[PDB]
Amino acid sequence: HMATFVELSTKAKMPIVGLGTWKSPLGKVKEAVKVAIDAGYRHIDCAYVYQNEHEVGEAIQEKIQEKAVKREDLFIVSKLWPTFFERPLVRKAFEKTLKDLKLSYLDVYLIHWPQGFKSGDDLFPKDDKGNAIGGKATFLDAWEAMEELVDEGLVKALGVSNFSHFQIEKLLNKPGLKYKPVTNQVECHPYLTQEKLIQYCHSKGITVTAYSPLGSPDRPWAKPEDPSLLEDPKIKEIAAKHKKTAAQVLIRFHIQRNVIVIPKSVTPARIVENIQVFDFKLSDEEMATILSFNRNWRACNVLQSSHLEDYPFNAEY
C-alpha cells in the first residue's frame, strides 16, 4: 500500500506512514527495511544514535539494485544527536550517517533533541551520578551548520524533534535564519494527544511526525503498571469493530489528523500490517473518543536531562 503524502513547506511530499528503527537490532533491521519496502513503505526514520544505520543502508542499496524501488520515491530521515552540536562535529556526524546509509542525500535531517550534551567520545556523557552533562554549543549553533548541508544539496530539508513551541519560536526568530524546519517529530498517541503543539506547528506551516505511536512497549524502562496503548480495551473495542488491530487504529488516528507517523517493528507480519491503514476510516465519534484519552503521559520524558537549559518538556507545549 502507498501511504498518502503530507506536503511540506518546500512542496516535497512526505509519506504519512514510515518505518521506525529505534531498538531494531543489527541482525534484524536490514530485513525489516527490505520487508517494509516490499510492503510499500517509502519513509524510513533513522538516527545516528540508533547505531544501525549501516544495515538500513545495505537494505536500501540492495532494493534499489533489485529495481524494487527508486531513490527519488524513498523518503529517508535521520537526526543529529546532541553531543555533535559544535560546528565541525555537525558535519562529521552527518557524514557518518550519510556514509552508513549509502545515500547521496537525505530527505530530512533533524535536530534530535534540543538540549545539548557535552562533546567527546561518550554518547551519553554523565554528571556524577548520571544526569546528563551539558554542552558548549546549542541547537542554534547546530542549525547553522545544518543549513550548509541544504545549500550543498546533501539534505533537502531540515527539521526538529522534541521541540516545544518556545523552542520553535527561538529557531524561527534566529537572526540570519536560512531554512525553516519542515517537521517537528514528537511523541504523540492517544495518551499524549499534543493538541496545542500540533495546532501551533500547523499554524507555522510545520508538519508533525508522531513517534512512539504504539506506546513504545519495548522501551527498556517500561513498567508493567505503565499505560499500555496496545492493550487498552477501548482502543481494542474500536479496532475489533473495524476488524483491524489495535496497532492499526493507533496509526490511523494520526493519519486522520494529518500527522505523519512512524511505527517501529522488526516482525515481518507486523511491518506489513502497520501500513494496511488506508482502507478504513475512524468515524468522527471514534476520533473524538480517542482524543479524549489524553493523559499527558510520555513514554520518553528523558528526565535525566531535565536540568539542562533546553530541556523541552517544562513548557506547557
Ligand SMILES: NC(=O)c1ccc[n+]([C@@H]2O[C@H](COP(=O)([O-])OP(=O)(O)OC[C@H]3O[C@@H](n4cnc5c(N)ncnc54)[C@H](OP(=O)(O)O)[C@@H]3O)[C@@H](O)[C@H]2O)c1
Ligand atoms: N525523535 C525521537 O526522540 C524519537 C523517540 C522515540 C521514537 N522515535 C522514532 O519513532 C519510532 C517508533 O517509536 P518506538 O520505537 O518508540 O515505539 P512504537 O513504534 O510505539 O512501538 C514499537 C513496539 O511495538 C511493537 N509492535 C509494532 N507493530 C506492532 C503490531 N502491529 N502489533 C503489536 N506490536 C507491535 C514492536 O515489536 P516488534 O518490533 O518486536 O515487532 C515494538 O516492541 C522509533 O523506532 C524511532 O524511529 C523517535
Ligand SMILES: COc1ccc2c(C(=S)N(C)CC(=O)O)cccc2c1C(F)(F)F
Ligand atoms: C536527551 O536525553 C535523552 C535522549 C534520548 C534517550 C534515549 C533514546 S536514544 N531514545 C529515547 C530514542 C530517541 O531519542 O530517538 C534512550 C535513553 C536515554 C535518553 C536520553 C537521556 F539520557 F537523557 F535520558
